[PDB]
């Protein structure tokens, strides 16, 4: 149950990243696609988590993009 | 014939389009998906029948949600005439019995 959760979270994260016009940079989009496709094919739940950290770092390293703090104060992420 | 349960569940959980993440807008998707997944109830393994039962319960929940969710803010009152056939196994059992209807 800890593996399907991370696969669903990865799908949602890739959708959110695509909504922010990331595919307008070929290298970043290729890396994101590779990570997302690698997570869904995983068999053990440690490689999936490190790839998840790597994929989330892409969204976190975009200043304007989204508001981390507002999205953390809505009874959401801590 | 019976399909792979993973295929049916994946079709349930992952969709193209955004308007298909709101079951009340399209209840006829799950009716077809449960038609495809009926023969899994005769399998000796136990989760395989649980797939079909889960689909039936989800269909009933979606119908109840639609009726109440529409009666509440608006005042239109819905009826449950010949709609309960979709969450009972006799509607789906008749698709695999030799008598050719429609």
């Amino acid at each position: 149950s800890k593996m399907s959760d991370v696969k669903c979270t990865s799908v949602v994260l890739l959708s959110v990243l695509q909504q922010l016009r990331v595919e307008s940079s070929s290298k970043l989009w290729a890396q994101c696609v590779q990570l997302h496709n690698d997570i869904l094919l995983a068999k053990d739940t440690t490689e999936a988590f490190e790839k998840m950290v790597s994929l989330l770092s892409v969204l976190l390293s975009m200043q304007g993009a989204v508001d981390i703090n507002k999205l953390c104060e809505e009874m959401l992420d801590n | 014939p019976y399909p792979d349960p993973s295929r049916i569940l994946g079709a349930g959980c992952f969709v193209d389009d955004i308007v298909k993440t709101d079951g009340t807008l399209m209840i006829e998707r799950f009716v077809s998906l449960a038609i495809d997944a009926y023969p899994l109830t005769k399998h000796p393994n136990q989760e395989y029948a649980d797939v079909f039962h889960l689909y039936l319960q989800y269909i009933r929940k979606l119908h109840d949600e639609l009726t109440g969710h529409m009666l509440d803010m608006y005042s239109v009152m819905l009826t449950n005439d010949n709609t309960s056939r979709y969450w009972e196994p006799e509607f789906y059992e008749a698709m695999y019995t030799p008598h050719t209807v429609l």
Partner: protein, 187 residues
């Protein structure tokens, strides 16, 4: 369906015929009463089903219009819905590295490139205040994303190199603060 004039006429005819028959009478009276009754009965019975079909059709039409309006509404809030959902699942996952980096980004310490996974390759973050430097950087090692990194360079907003010994409590507030640490992943 008891709100139509046809129902009233049929009811009056029914009552009159029933009373006359129960009182007992001849054949011609019964024949005349039934010839005046059956037309009203048919008049009632036609509308009794026409009204039902009209009502159910109206209900279905209102249902369809509600569904169309709801779909049109739903397909116009996707960005916010997806972001809220993503952060809800990120809460539910409950991982230490993800929590660490999310809190770090929430306080101001964000990365500048993709976090590497190998025992090599460079990582660059931004440290905007002395408190974050106190929490993360102590000594010559760096703790980020539940890992260990080794500082090798510090650069300020003026791009001048700052040695590690320089940074201190009172010795810091004369500097361009948005520092940029570049480290490599410790074994």
């Amino acid at each position: 369906f008891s709100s139509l004039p046809s129902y009233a006429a049929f009811a009056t005819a029914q009552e009159a015929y029933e009373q006359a028959v129960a009182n007992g009478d001849s054949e011609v009276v019964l024949k005349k009463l039934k010839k005046s009754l059956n037309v009203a009965k048919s008049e009632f019975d036609r509308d009794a089903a026409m009204q039902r079909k009209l009502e159910k059709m109206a209900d279905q039409a209102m249902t369809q219009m509600y569904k169309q309006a709801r779909s049109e509404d739903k397909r116009a809030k996707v960005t916010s819905a997806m972001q809220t959902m993503l952060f809800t699942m990120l809460r539910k996952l409950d991982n230490d590295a993800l929590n660490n980096i999310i809190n770090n980004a929430r306080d101001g310490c964000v990365p500048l490139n993709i976090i590497p996974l190998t025992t090599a390759a460079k990582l660059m973050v931004v440290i905007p205040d002395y408190n974050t430097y106190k929490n993360t950087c102590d000594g010559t090692t760096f703790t980020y994303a539940s890992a260990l990194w080794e500082i090798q360079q510090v650069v300020d907003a003026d791009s001048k190199i700052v040695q590690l010994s320089e940074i201190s409590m009172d010795n810091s507030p004369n500097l361009a603060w948005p520092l940029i640490v570049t480290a490599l992943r410790a074994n």
